[PDB]
Amino acid sequence: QHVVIGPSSLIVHFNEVIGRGHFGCVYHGTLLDGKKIHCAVKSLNRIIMKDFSHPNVLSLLGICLRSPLVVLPYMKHGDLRNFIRNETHNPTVKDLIGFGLQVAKGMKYLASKKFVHRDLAARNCMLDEKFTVKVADFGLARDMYDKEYYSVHNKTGAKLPVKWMALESLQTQKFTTKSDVWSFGVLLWELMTRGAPPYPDVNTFDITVYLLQGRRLLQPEYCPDPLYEVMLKCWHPKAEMRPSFSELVSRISAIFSTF
């Protein structure tokens, strides 16, 4: 109720598409809070986060009752994967570790709230005008945009990002903060390669036996040795043996501080 935005306080620029998802489009929007704000509007045309508040977590501006609409802050620099892949951008190894640290802090907050993300990947993190990373694609903002990285379970209907998933998640379809810890390691490997696709020579069926063989993503050329050790710990076959997000924040901030 205290999340509701009056239709007169919002303009959805339906001709200005930010992105096309499975459950609906994200459009540019104008919102009157009495300041006029540029925002992003998620339509749920096919078919809790209000209490979440952390600088590295995507916040909910509100919902427009009126097709239901989800009003979110606007992210000037879009998703993290396309930002780092853009050949005209010049991030340094420090900028990239800085991004990883920011994601670890947002995930540390979410894990404390006992919230399991289930789809942590560089494509699911956003960058605002201050280059503040916001973990996104969760709660009311959850959706599938890049369908080539997902298998839809023919029984549950669950979207499964096979190449970001923990070995136990691939075997059971069960997701925990520790399987989110595994995806964080793949996300750090995405940062260090500037958005290369993970396991390009391994097809989605051969991935389980690949991981069972103790095989893992290889060290990217400009990845510092301690940061690769941090990735390797995220990918231990035993969920309990993996670091917590609190331990990842401490380890990564110490690596970031050596620069």
Ligand SMILES: O=C1NCc2c(-c3cc(F)cc4[nH]ncc34)c[nH]c21
């Ligand atoms: O291709 C894309 N699909 C969705 C999307 C977003 C996005 C999602 C979101 F939940 C909030 C947002 N605020 N500003 C942008 C934005 C940016 N780019 C793309």
